[PDB]
Structures are given as structure tokens and as C-alpha cells.
Amino acid sequence: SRYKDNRPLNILGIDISKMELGRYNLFEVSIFLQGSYLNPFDPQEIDVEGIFEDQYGNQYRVPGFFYQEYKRELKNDYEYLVPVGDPYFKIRFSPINIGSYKFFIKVKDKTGREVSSDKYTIYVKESEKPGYIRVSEKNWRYFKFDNGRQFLPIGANICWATSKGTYDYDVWLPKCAENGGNYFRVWLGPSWATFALERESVKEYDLKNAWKLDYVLNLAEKLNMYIMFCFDSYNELRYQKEGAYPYWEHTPHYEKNGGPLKEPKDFWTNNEMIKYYKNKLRYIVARYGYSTNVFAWEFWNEVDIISPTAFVIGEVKKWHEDMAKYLNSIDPWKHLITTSFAFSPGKPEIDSISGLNFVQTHIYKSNRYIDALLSLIAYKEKYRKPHLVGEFGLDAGGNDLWVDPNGYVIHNAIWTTILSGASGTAMSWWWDNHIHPNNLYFHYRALADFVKDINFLEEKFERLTNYKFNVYNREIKVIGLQGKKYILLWLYNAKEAYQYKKDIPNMDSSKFLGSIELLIKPPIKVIYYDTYRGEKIKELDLDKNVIPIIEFERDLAIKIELL
Ligand SMILES: OC[C@H]1O[C@@H](O[C@H]2[C@H](O)[C@H](O)[C@H](O)O[C@@H]2CO)[C@@H](O)[C@@H](O)[C@@H]1O
């Protein structure tokens, strides 16, 4: 209890960032106070709240959070944070309507005493921000922003940094964003993670790592990138003898290390653990919920490979139901909620929960992974909510960086997933040792430039069929979408797409390979698109339903417009 206080409850000061701001922008209040509490992260010890009301009567009850300011520096090869000033409490709000808001601050400590701040008025003007990310009501396969524009996640996992900490995100994120990336995922556990909130304790949260997460979220705000926050990872509940980067012996949850749990099975039902987990959710909502750059709350990385002594499907399901309900109830902005599994088909008992707004796949597979992605995407349409392939790679023991230094595997997967009907790109691993040093960002730029002007929410896209190849010299396969107005094709050579030794193609090729006949009504306009250079190659008007296939080395994209 290093942050305890033993004084009569009183507000000592309030600082307000600005009295005028734009729609969906951050409005921050600093609160200096004294009171009686053992743990500023526990609302039963001290509960700070901001009560906001727009001019239409809508009310928002925003929990406040304990905060320490830091100044970062780089000490040779590691980030070091110097504390600045005493810690204090903050409220972070974001207005969804324009016009006037009134708000006040309310504080209650463990004595039951309650104090209040006077009503303040702020004014909100229109801004460029599109709002929070939601499931599309027009097409449940896809995400939208509040303003109705689509959100197609294009990016990769970027889940933790080296010892350089936030300085790595300074490098990775601008490169991602300038190459069409608008998405990444970060880990808030286990305790070794860059943004670990439960670093030494499950009762009190790490103010340095929370500040690093502030920094990276602010950088995403500047770059128009949107983040999935993964709260916990399976390692926390996996025993040393079970392998796969286990961490139970080191995790703060374990009684040996000060926590409430005698064994990982008890995580799901232990009353003390559930209480502190809800305090963590409240802290996360308080500190980060305002941000439209939070794409989603993700409870678990691969919860199915916690210790087999700890995975009880009925209890994990109930815990996800209860925590999703709680999180929704306290999150004024109702961010999307999800969870993930190592087993690529997932766990239907959990994926079917209505409180999980979208489902995910993790898949590491070396052989015929294009077909495996297609099959999984087709299968999970049964949930009638969006599907994110949140992790993807070879099953090569982490050797992708030297088996495939050109990123052909990533290339194949991001084209396959977005043109099979998934909500966005397959999300690669290996951001730090592969994507960045091998400079693989250009793959994403080529894909983003192909899809960005299509409104997927209105095309009524269906996976391509009723097609007939007529190709004699090669084995060419197709992944395709057929919509109201567009047909999008990704063609690949089955005998070249899975070999990674040759250099990046630079076709000069103008040559005729074969044809693909589609059941569509002509006339049409056909655009041939280089998937490595990210450029239109050729354009052709047609009066029949048979599209010539021009020469290409590994794969080729075609955009067809029904006229
Ligand atoms: O290297 C940093 C952390 O790696 C962690 O293991 C990772 C591992 O690097 C790899 O990405 C693997 O497939 O997923 C693991 C996490 O589940 C931990 O070993 C951690 O201790 C390291 O700091």
C-alpha cells in the first residue's frame, strides 16, 4: 500500500485541459485530493467519478484513475522513466455530441464521506473524427465508424517493444501508418509485457507501464491507427512444466508471489481475484476508454492453452459472459469486446456469447495455408458477426524471417483474408524481427490502395463461385469476392505461391495466360493490379463474361466493375 493516505477527504485542486474541444477529442481533468484510502486502484477505498451531461440530457459516468507523470529518456539501449511531481487522479472524457456539456467531480473514500466539485460547462464543436468502431449494421462481416464509414483493419501484431519501450513504437508505427496500416494489437499482460498493468501485483497497477500505454495510444491518435488491447495472456495461467513460454510460477496472481490464487484453475471463480479483475477493467476504462483509437477490448490471448488443470469450459464461458456484461456496463463508450484461442477453429461455446462482438482466428500453418484460411473464414460465418484473423504465420518455430525474408507468406495471407470475406487483413506476428528489418510494409500499401475506395459495407460481397478456369499451361487458383458492383479477384500460381526463394517479381509480362469465365452480366471494365508494386498494370473493356488472365509470376489482383 505505498500510495495510501490517511487524511479527511477533501478536493485540493482541479485543473481542466481546455474548455472548448472537438467531437470525440480528449477532455482531461486533473484532480488533486486528500482522503483515507489504502489503495488508489480500488474503488472500495477511493472512488473518483466525473458525471457528464450533454445538452440533450444524456449522462456519462466516467470513473477516474490514479496517475503519475513521467519524463522518458533513452539510456543507451533502454527506456528510463523519471517521475515528475506527485501522483494524482485524472478523468478522461470524450464527447460524442457537439454543443454544451455540464459536468462535476464526485469523490467517495473508505469512510463513506462524499465530496463534490461545482458544475462546469464546456463546449464541443464539430471535428473530423469519425467516432468509435462498431459492428456494421449493413453487413455483419465488417466494422464501421460511428459516422458510417467502414473500418477495414490493415496492420499487424505489434504487441510489445524491446527494452527501448516507447522508442520502438516511435519507429514501427509511422512506418506502418505511411504504408496503409491502421491497426495493431498490444499486450497488457503477462507481467513482462511493455504495457503490463499487473506487473508486481494484481491489486495495484503499474503507473510506468500505464504511462507507456498512454504514449503509444497518443501516437496512434496522431497517426489514425486503432488498437486492440489484449488484457491477459495464457502464459499467466500455464505451469512451467507445461512449456510454451509458461509464466504461472512468476505471475502476481499466484499466492507464492502475493496473489490470491493457489492454482490457475481458481482464477475463474475466486471471489478476491474476480473483485480485483473488475477493478482492473475499471482502471482500463477510466484511463483509456475515452479513446476512439481503442478498437477493441480483448480479454485473453489464447485462453484455451492455459494449464489443462485450469481450463474448465463452462467456467471460462461464464466468466467471459459476466466480465463482458460488467465491462460493457461501466464503459461509457461501449467499445467492442472479444477474446482469442490458439485452436484455430476456436471454442463455439465462448465465441457464440452475445457479449463478444466479434470472433477471431489464430493460425500458424506452413502447408496450404491459403486453403486453411478460406475454410476457417467460411466456417465462422456461422456466428453472424465479424471475424478477425488476429494472428497468422508459418508453423516454422519462429523461422519465418529467414525462410521467407521477402514476406510472401504475409503477402499471401493478407490478400486471401480480405478477399475471402474476413473483416480485415490476417495479422502477422514477428513485427520486430521480421516485418520491420525486412521492410515488409510495402505489402500492406499495395493491398490498402487496392481496397480503400470500395465501400465493403454496401457491396453485398459474396465469396466467388460459378467460375470456370480455362488455363492450360499452369495451375492457377482464385480467391474472390462478387458484389453488387465490383468483383475482386486474387489469382495465384499454386506451384509458385508457396516457394519463397526468388526475388520480388517485377513483371514486364504482357503475355496471355488463359481466362476465367464468371457468371456476371456484361459489359464490364477490368483493371489488372500489381500486388507487389501496388499499381494498375492494365485496363480493358469487355462485352463478354470471360476475362483474359495476363502473365504474372506468383499472384495478381483483378478489379472488375459491372457497368
Ligand atoms: O522476447 C520477448 C518475450 O518473448 C516471450 O515469448 C514470446 C516469444 O518471443 C514468441 O513471440 C512466442 O511465440 O510467444 C511468446 C509469448 O507467448 C517471453 O519469452 C518473454 O519472456 C519475453 O520477454
Ligand SMILES: OC[C@H]1O[C@@H](O)[C@@H](O)[C@@H](O)[C@@H]1O
Ligand atoms: O525501433 C525498432 C528497432 O530499430 C532498430 O534500428 C534498432 O534501433 C533497435 O534497437 C530497435 O529496437
